[PDB]
Write a protein that binds this ligand. Structure first.
Ligand SMILES: *[C@@H]1O[C@H](CO)[C@@H](O[C@@H]2O[C@H](CO)[C@@H](O[C@@H]3O[C@H](CO)[C@@H](O[C@@H]4O[C@H](CO)[C@@H](O)[C@H](O)[C@@H]4O)[C@H](O)[C@@H]3O)[C@H](O)[C@H]2NC(C)=O)[C@H](O)[C@H]1NC(C)=O
Ligand SMILES: *[C@@H]1O[C@H](CO)[C@@H](O[C@@H]2O[C@H](CO)[C@@H](O[C@@H]3O[C@H](CO[C@@H]4O[C@H](CO)[C@@H](O)[C@H](O)[C@@H]4O)[C@@H](O)[C@H](O)[C@@H]3O)[C@H](O)[C@H]2NC(C)=O)[C@H](O)[C@H]1NC(C)=O
Ligand SMILES: *[C@@H]1O[C@H](CO)[C@@H](O[C@@H]2O[C@H](CO)[C@@H](O)[C@H](O)[C@H]2NC(C)=O)[C@H](O)[C@H]1NC(C)=O
Ligand SMILES: *[C@@H]1O[C@H](CO)[C@@H](O)[C@H](O)[C@H]1NC(C)=O
Ligand SMILES: *[C@@H]1O[C@H](CO)[C@@H](O)[C@H](O)[C@H]1NC(C)=O
Ligand SMILES: [Ca+2]
Ligand SMILES: [Ca+2]
Ligand SMILES: [Ca+2]
Ligand SMILES: [Ca+2]
Ligand SMILES: [Ca+2]
Ligand SMILES: [Ca+2]
Ligand SMILES: [Mg+2]
Lengths: 368, 7, 448
């Protein structure tokens, strides 16, 4: 029983040769047993989906340009950090209802900046703008297009915007086989749960999506703001890591806020975004992968077993996958195959596919 | 800000 | 537990958003429940102060006849307009002898004079019902011919336009009504106190703008630490200066000092006797306040709700349940200090501590006992009302009785409740619970 190595291209270290060797011819005699060691290494970069939420209030006006930069710059950095990226975004002002807006004179419903003789867009709960896409150019163009609206009071409904950013997928366009990051902007205090009771809204924000066709938070005027708890539930359940990118004015408020939400971080949204981009790459440093193998196109008659040697260099029998691999680590698997006699087919072909790897070990087997 | 105004 | 007495309202009406008790000079006790979206005779949701008489079966209530027509009064080259469109006539109700004060926080109000106007801002307005005399007076201490430009020019000093006056309201034992408008002074908040007798005497039909001589509006402030706190979102009255000759005002602002939230104790003359600050940020420390002698030593103690409080538990998890802060008044002329006791809910996302109902004493003994709300508590996530059997030392962390929502999802059962009032005169307070989402109110006649 000799196993001739056919395709043995070396592992890349970033062809993206993620499995070595690639093709093997296995020759067997009746009642035979034989073990060979394969090696596998992650090569290509990691997948990521960034959603971006922005204030649009009269207030936000002071730092509007600021938050716009925090979009585009961010994308650029994660273009240099990975190739498998998607980016999407949404905007928000406050609950569209008195006393948060101006309703007199009636023109205020179309322009609540009547007293300043200026034009501001009719203020809105949450208007989801761009679904997540690899088209970063379209994301940049749509982010820059957003402009300022008006409300009455200083706090704004950002938590409503985050809940509707994470709470639905099809509208927003996430990927199950990827990491998720959510960057939230503001410059003033945030309307939290129980703020909307000033406008007659006493029904909470639940864990369901209320955006349909019009690209608006339909149930904005009838659903209250969301609390930090349900925020955390929706961030964790969907595997979303939050970064509060806020102005230095009351950055302590959001540092305390981040202490209040497990796993989230806070950046000083300002003239620069170093404090936020460094935290982006920090969160990117913590992504751990898994190398798990399956075997396809093999009959039941042939029996198989294995050992495994991971990055820890500790040999384990019966464990086909270690938890928490990184980029560049090599894992070896010694597979033992036992054949019971010579079948009539006399020539088989099967695959060993690492889970989530398009590359596979194609094995041709002959019996003498 | 006291209201939606620039500080 | 069978006598879960149901009071019904029409669809849309939000029957139960606010509630209180009334005892006319005739002596008939009625549940006054405000449905802020009741359909008027003009097929418009404005508000309805359902004077529900105490009926075992409950059901639809006789909508007490409040003037729903908008007054386009003319005086001094000005037009006083009281926009009652979506006014919420019923988002806060109180009573005192044969007087019912039923306040529309969203009763928009305006002055048309040349091009300028007062802006239809939810100044609020308490309708004064004297049903025995049939006197339909009106009160709005916040109602003001002051133009928008005048308010802007003075850095919004005393900017009362957005009062939502009658957002909360209490009646002083002496007979003067104190209304808490969190929207006061540009959402800073304020208290406006005036006798009911004086406003009744000063009332004239179709005037809607008249200075009341005995009104007492709160002093505004300029320290940013009070900004957007909603200094008045919750209001109550207790004695904290140890001087029974004056009445002390306890104000809960749940967003005080950047979402920390506080409760201030002031004298009758609107001067700070003390301030008590929030432990956990964004927990809404001051959403609901409650003044009572939980200790029962003769000195009033303060109870604050924090319905967005999140605790730390095993595996280092921050689970959002809520909290109740109890501050105890020290013996003699001593100021209140650190949170005397701390009480916490169990169910996740329950908004535990949204509404606190002073229950007085449950077992008719002497330990002051209270109740607290959790509109989305319980295993199901529908509603929860938790009875805190208080102690001579303070408040126990394990609620004695938990009432679950018999309504479906979205009802916000327990969101506004009230006790301390005996309906059947059995000698025990009766807990009335305003499940607004289902347009119903549940009265539980608590047997100890
Ligand atoms: C109170 O609660 C809610 C809040 O308003 C109400 O819910 C809405 O009520 C309207 C009633 O006008 C309802 O419209 C009905 O739709 C039916 C079709 O599903 C209509 O046809 C009926 O179909 C029956 C099934 O075959 C048939 O047997 C019957 O003869 C009739 O033809 C019906 O006539 C109504 O127009 C809305 O669907 C409903 N919407 C929601 C979102 O709830 C509720 O009705 C109110 N209940 C009461 C008792 O007042
Ligand atoms: C959220 O961020 C804020 C800043 O934005 C952090 O505020 C910090 O709060 C601490 C106190 O928790 C401050 O330390 C001291 O505070 C006292 C004032 O409080 C005292 O209170 C007791 C009773 O509670 C009274 O008896 C005293 O008289 C007194 O009033 C002050 O006197 C000290 O000099 C000292 O400042 C700290 O200063 C403050 N930091 C800033 C930058 O303002 C807050 O910690 C943070 N939240 C959490 C949970 O960390
Ligand atoms: C991979 O591990 C398996 C067992 O999981 C190895 O089989 C062992 O071979 C040795 C002889 O060298 C025997 O003494 C053991 O009894 C066998 N199995 C076990 C687990 O005890 C197999 O040989 C390993 N492959 C390599 C590369 O050595
Ligand atoms: C194969 O298995 C034998 C025992 O079964 C072991 O001694 C040897 O180290 C293994 N590896 C190879 C590929 O020979
Ligand atoms: C209480 O106030 C009244 C009203 O002025 C006063 O006449 C009375 O003397 C006061 N009583 C005490 C004990 O101070
Ligand atoms: Ca700004
Ligand atoms: Ca606002
Ligand atoms: Ca006093
Ligand atoms: Ca006491
Ligand atoms: Ca007792
Ligand atoms: Ca009773
Ligand atoms: Mg703003």
């Amino acid at each position: 029983s000799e196993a001739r190595v056919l395709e043995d291209r070396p592992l890349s270290d970033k062809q993206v040769t993620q499995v070595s060797p690639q093709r093997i011819a296995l020759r067997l005699r009746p009642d035979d047993s034989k073990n060979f060691s394969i090696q596998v290494r992650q090569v290509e970069d990691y997948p990521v989906d960034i959603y971006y939420l922005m204030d649009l209030s009269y207030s936000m006006k002071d730092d509007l340009w600021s938050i716009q930069n925090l979009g585009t710059k961010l994308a650029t950095q994660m273009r240099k950090l990975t190739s498998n990226l998607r980016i999407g975004f949404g905007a928000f002002v406050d609950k569209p209802v008195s006393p948060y807006m101006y309703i007199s004179p009636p023109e205020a419903l179309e322009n609540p900046c009547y007293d300043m003789k200026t034009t501001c867009l009719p203020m809105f709960g949450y208007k989801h703008v761009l679904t997540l896409t690899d088209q970063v150019t379209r994301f940049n163009e749509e982010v820059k297009k957003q402009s300022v609206s008006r409300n009455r009071d200083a706090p704004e409904g950002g938590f409503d915007a985050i809940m509707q950013a994470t709470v639905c997928d099809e509208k927003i366009g996430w990927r199950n086989d990827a990491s998720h990051l959510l960057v939230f902007t503001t410059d003033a205090k945030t309307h939290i749960a129980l703020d909307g009771r000033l406008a007659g809204i006493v029904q909470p924000n639940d864990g369901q999506c209320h955006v349909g066709s019009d690209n608006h938070y339909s149930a904005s005027t009838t659903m209250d703001y969301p609390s930090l708890g349900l925020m955390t539930e929706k961030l964790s359940q969907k595997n979303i890591n939050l970064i509060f990118a806020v102005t230095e004015n009351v950055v302590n408020l959001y540092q305390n806020y981040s202490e209040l939400i497990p796993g989230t971080t806070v950046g000083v949204l300002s003239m620069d975004s170093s404090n936020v981009l460094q935290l982006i790459v920090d969160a990117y440093g913590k992504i751990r992968s898994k190398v798990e193998l399956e075997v396809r196109d093999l009959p039941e008659e042939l029996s198989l077993s294995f050992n495994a040697t991971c990055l820890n260099n500790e040999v384990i029998p019966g464990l086909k996958s270690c938890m928490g691999l990184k980029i560049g680590d090599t894992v070896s698997f010694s597979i033992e195959a036992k054949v019971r006699g010579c079948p009539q087919e006399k020539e088989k072909s099967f695959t060993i596919k690492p889970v989530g790897f398009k590359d596979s070990l194609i094995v041709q087997v002959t019996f003498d | 800000x006291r209201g939606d105004w620039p500080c | 537990p069978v006598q879960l007495t149901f009071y019904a309202g029409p669809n849309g009406s939000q029957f139960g958003f606010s509630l209180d008790f009334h005892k006319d000079s005739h002596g008939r006790v009625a549940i006054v429940v405000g449905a802020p979206r009741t359909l008027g005779p003009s097929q418009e949701e404005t508000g309805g102060v359902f004077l529900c008489p105490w009926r075992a079966e409950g059901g639809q209530c006789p909508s007490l006849l409040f003037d729903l027509r908008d007054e386009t009064r003319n005086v001094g080259s000005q037009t006083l307009q009281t926009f009652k469109a979506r006014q919420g006539l019923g988002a806060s109700v109180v009573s005192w002898s044969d007087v019912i004060v039923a306040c529309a926080p969203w009763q928009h109000w305006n002055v048309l004079e040349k091009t300028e106007e007062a802006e239809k801002t939810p100044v609020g307005s308490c309708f004064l019902a004297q049903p025995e005399s049939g006197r339909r007076a009106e009160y709005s201490p916040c109602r003001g011919n002051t133009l928008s430009r005048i308010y802007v020019e003075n850095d919004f000093s005393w900017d009362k336009r957005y009062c939502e006056a009658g957002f909360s309201s209490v009646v002083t034992q002496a007979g003067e009504l104190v209304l808490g408008a969190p929207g006061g002074y540009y959402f800073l908040g304020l208290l406006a106190q005036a006798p009911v007798a004086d406003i009744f005497s000063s009332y004239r039909p179709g005037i809607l703008l008249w200075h009341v001589s005995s009104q007492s509006l709160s002093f505004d402030s300029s320290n940013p630490e009070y900004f957007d706190g909603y200094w008045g979102y919750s209001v109550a009255v207790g004695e904290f200066d140890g001087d029974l000759n004056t009445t002390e005002y306890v104000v809960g602002a749940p967003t005080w000092s950047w979402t920390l939230g506080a409760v201030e104790i002031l004298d009758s003359y609107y001067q700070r006797l003390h301030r008590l600050r929030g432990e956990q940020m964004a927990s809404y420390f001051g959403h609901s306040v409650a003044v009572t002698d939980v200790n029962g030593d003769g000195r009033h103690d303060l109870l604050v709700g924090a319905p967005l409080y999140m605790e730390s538990r095993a595996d280092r998890k921050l689970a959002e349940v809520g909290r109740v802060y109890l501050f105890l008044q020290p013996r003699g002329p001593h100021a209140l200090g650190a949170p005397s006791l701390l009480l916490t809910g169990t169910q996740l996302y329950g908004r535990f501590g949204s509404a606190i109902a002073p229950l007085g004493d449950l077992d008719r003994d002497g330990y002051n006992d209270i109740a607290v709300a959790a509109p989305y508590g319980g295993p199901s996530g529908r509603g929860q009302v938790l009875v805190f059997l208080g102690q001579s030392e303070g408040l126990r962390s394990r609620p004695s009785q938990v009432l679950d929502s018999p309504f479906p999802t979205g009802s916000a059962f327990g969101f506004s409740l009230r006790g301390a009032v005996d309906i059947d005169d059995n000698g025990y307070p009766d807990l009335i619970v305003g499940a607004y989402g289902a347009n119903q109110v549940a009265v539980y006649r608590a047997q100890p």
